[model samples]
Target chain A: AGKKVLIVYAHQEPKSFNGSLKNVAVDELSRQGCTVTVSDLYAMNFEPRATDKDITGTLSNPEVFNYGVETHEAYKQRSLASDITDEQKKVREADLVIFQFPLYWFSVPAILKGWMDRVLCQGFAFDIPGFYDSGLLQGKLALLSVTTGGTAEMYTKTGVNGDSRYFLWPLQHGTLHFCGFKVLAPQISFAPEIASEEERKGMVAAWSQRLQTIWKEEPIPCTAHWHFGQ
Target chain B: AGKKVLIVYAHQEPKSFNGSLKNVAVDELSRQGCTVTVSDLYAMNFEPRATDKDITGTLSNPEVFNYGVETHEAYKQRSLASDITDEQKKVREADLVIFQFPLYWFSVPAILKGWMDRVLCQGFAFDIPGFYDSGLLQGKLALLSVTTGGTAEMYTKTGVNGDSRYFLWPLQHGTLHFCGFKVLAPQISFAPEIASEEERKGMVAAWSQRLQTIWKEEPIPCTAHWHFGQ
Candidate 1:
């Protein structure tokens, strides 16, 4: 396939389980003739704070800094920070996007969350009348490859984490799906640290195998009922 | 009767609706004879990235930086970054911890998320065998007072954004409850940007009023059923 893929990776160690997952995606996709780009957030020391610093142009009102309004205006004027603009270009060019990271506090780490906040601006990812199914990037695809600290058993309805899908609603529905990406089923590699090397390999292999036919898959409904049973 | 309250506030603008909410909480709580502390995360330029930089001392493994493992050891070694340690001290001293932020991607803002990742490390907030009901920070109480971009109706079950409670499960159950804090019901101020001046004032007043009786409200079950009904 000639699809361009972007992996917004967030992990400090290249040898970590997250790294393995990231590497496998690149290898599998590239082998299939797809152009791939990885934004290694930690290596980049990605700015996680969303503030006035992100905008390079004149503020609508400097005395009163409203991040959403200012950033939306800056995005339209091409005055967003170069780093943000650079990532936006990659996102614009990609057919599929994958977020690879360890789940921090049942969601994305600060750095990756920063990317979602800063890069996906109003005029870019969504607009007032252009969110959810009508969002700006409606044709693109997104997937979350998350590694959790707790095991699969701990994330059940009766378990401590209260069903892993419960945590996915914010990321999959609120953020990704809201911005109009067709969300594929998430890759939840539970408790990689606790798993044996053989089990880890099995998880990695499963991910690689899935990528071989990712285009043949259908996106999830990304609805409330799908995440939380009726 | 004396109590301490810590407000972890995340907003770029001091004059915005979020600021109004944050201000009212401080004013109302302080008037009630509570010693109040505010961590203005944006003003503080809080580091949201959980990296080895968080650990000031020698790393457990210099070659591979596993943030959780490193920070856990750093917590035990008394070598965590001063900013993280300082925030931990605030949590240790506070009776009720209130998180005030504009909802970013249906969860806490990146800066606030960083505080959770960096400050609430393993040894400080939880341990291997001591999480969920048995977490270290058991006696504390936490509440999320959030402002949103969409209307209250939009966040309902059949609406475009799903139920607001659906988005709260991760923060309330997985993070705060897992850390053993008795979670209080959140104050959701929906679509403040579109609300009239009177409506904004009403929302802020309601939050201030709630703080007066926050202690009397019981923690939700913090389970799947509570967040998503059958």
Candidate 2:
């Protein structure tokens, strides 16, 4: 009941499968005596591009701008953009973070990706020496609940799309795990739009069911072997 | 000499390492008597969000919107946004598309990712059965000329970051390969910011030399074995 959850949601349509997963999480997590906050990215029209606008003070060098370098300084100076700081506060307060979206270009949607780029600045998420296991948010948990256009068969090892976990490497291991979050196994709902209405409900129900035991679920290995091993 | 190369460049600063790599490409390609066009994403302030705004005509099913379905129908109706169609034209005309960006979360920047999502529509890039080998842009070559903050050793199989190819799987196989592009072996200039001026120059020179022999180079296997083989 003391736990806080942040659902950084990205979906254009409220009735989309991604949106449904997001809504179910909010409802179920709240029912589990958790305080849930959802950042509706599309509705907020969240800024995705990293630019000079992200910093609120004089440039670190003013001559040549490096995003990672500049943002690290800004984070220390507490001069990061207000929008970025707002999201960071939510992330800071959360015990578990759930990213809900469709798989866009085999990663996060532009809006969500931007959120990761801008919000998770060097000092906030991980420092050069403080990444992976020693990252800033080491005690927190993160999960990606994704929907895809491809079917289960099409995403196999020998299938045309290769394994689904291949695509998850960047988001789960590279981003989340690098930031020191204990990474949950992704909840992938394949080809929900093409599935029958009953099947769709079953998929949604399965997600709701999973959330009930989310706290007890063990994290995946978050390694190359776990993702690509035989 | 008549070959057209499109460099979709993403960076906030012009004098930065990523910017330097882009400039050298334009210069070297021009020297070789080839036509080079650079899409400076930061300068262009490209729209990364895929919304109903991407379509001009009436919604296919306004009651409950589906972005993929709506965009696919819009592509058929020739009502996609001017920006999307504008980039599609570049892809259609180019023999090679080179994406130059600093790795953000082990993938392309949000701006570049948005470009892939918006431009590569169903009918334009690939259809239901037209992906991977049969993709619409099959003959066109695509390459990811990336710059990373991590050193070469840090990205190895035993390093804090796994093999670099683990991160490349999504962008190369899922996005580019699915759209029917022959993926060239990526030109990764690792940790250029941390390198000495002489080393940076060497990295840039290597890229220029690669461009001279680019056409003769062969595409990578774009397979699981190639990415994770023992």
Candidate 3:
């Protein structure tokens, strides 16, 4: 059977560079006989705020609303909102989950960050004793396909921005690894907006070529040293 | 004639530990005769998504939307959304900007992240050539007063999370310093949920005491070594 790939895309314009990357992923994956699904966050106007509304049923502690505790209990009770539950189902079914977005303030856009916060509830993605190596989403693969406003050189250790990997620690190690996904090395397409049309096309082509041998690639060790050198 | 302080507060519950910190800041800063203003993100239901709606009048280029470019142009044209513009005004007038929130997944909550992405636009908070030490928000001080789910010991260099400083690089250097704000040492109140009532009260009191000498405090020397020790 073909693999299932879910791309959680966070961008507004379908004609933008980010959109191009997402489309390329769909095209390449489909060509490989993979089932491709997308969650276009901006298009869907995904609710980015986490509130009591996330839990459809009775609150575990009505007097106090601790988000982590409330949502954790709600997940156990299967009382989460349909949107959250629906996204969870997609995650559960997908063999590979790719996050495609433009880097905002050195992190994922708030809309995409909201997906991580709400969708990855304690009982669903991880638990206190079951996080890291033993997370609920074990065996699934996750990749961050990000585009940046800065140049590749600017992201180096001595560069003006300091190594690109410096910014990935929170997303790669803290969130993805904590949730138990085998994290592939990130695909960072730097300064595409400033590149020539030909250069942009080259970047897209390179991404497609990488996907051709993606299955044979191994996940990164995802340790602090991998992100920040000793 | 007093220095103006703007605290961007993000947390759902008014009775939560985050709320207590926010309240203490208001009390301490007010007592010092500093004009304090707060942008309570959650209470405002601040819009987290960056879209065409952010530009109320018209898009400079409707064909392809680049958030950085579009938002910069809108900001220059004075056609940006009122909510965004209002926050910009607050930033412009403030001598100091303090972000108070609970750390979700090793970062600020999505709502606060949205504020950083939207409000801190190119023309308003920074320009391409005028970034880092030469940013538009130069001479303005920024501080992150954060609360975390883990204990202080767990965030140490030998601990599982690697030094808490490792997680601060992106927010401190990448965003704050990149935008020309001199950052103060982060005030991380760890594991408030696990602390006893007396400990929680002590944490709040300590924060208030810190604010008493905040004006006299110098900004941290933001460098690679400060974030990732040699």
Which candidate tops DockQ? 1
lDDT of 1 by residue, A76-188 (tens): 88899999999999999999999999999999999999999899989999997878898998999999999998899988877767788889999998999989999999999
- In model 1, pairs of residues that clash are none
State each candidate's chain A TM-score.
Answer: 0.98, 0.98, 0.98
Interface DockQ of candidate 3 = 0.80
Query: Using alpha carbons, what is the TM-score of model 1?
Result: 0.98
lDDT-best of 2 and 3: 2
**Per-residue accuracy of model 3 over B103-169 as CA lDDT, tens digit each:** 9888889898899989989898889688999999999999999999889998987677778898898
lDDT string, candidate 2, B1-230, tens digits = 48999999999889888888999999998998988899999999999888899999999999888888889999999999999999999989999999999999999999888998899999999998898889999899999999998999999999989999889988998888888999999999999878998999999999988988998999999887887775
Candidate with more favorable, higher DockQ: 2 or 3: 2
DockQ by candidate, in order:
0.88, 0.83, 0.80
User: What C-alpha lDDT do the candidate models reach, one value each?
Assistant: 0.91, 0.91, 0.91
Candidate 3, residue B136: Cα displacement in angstroms equals 0.9
Off by over 4 Å in 1: none
The candidate that wins on lDDT is 2
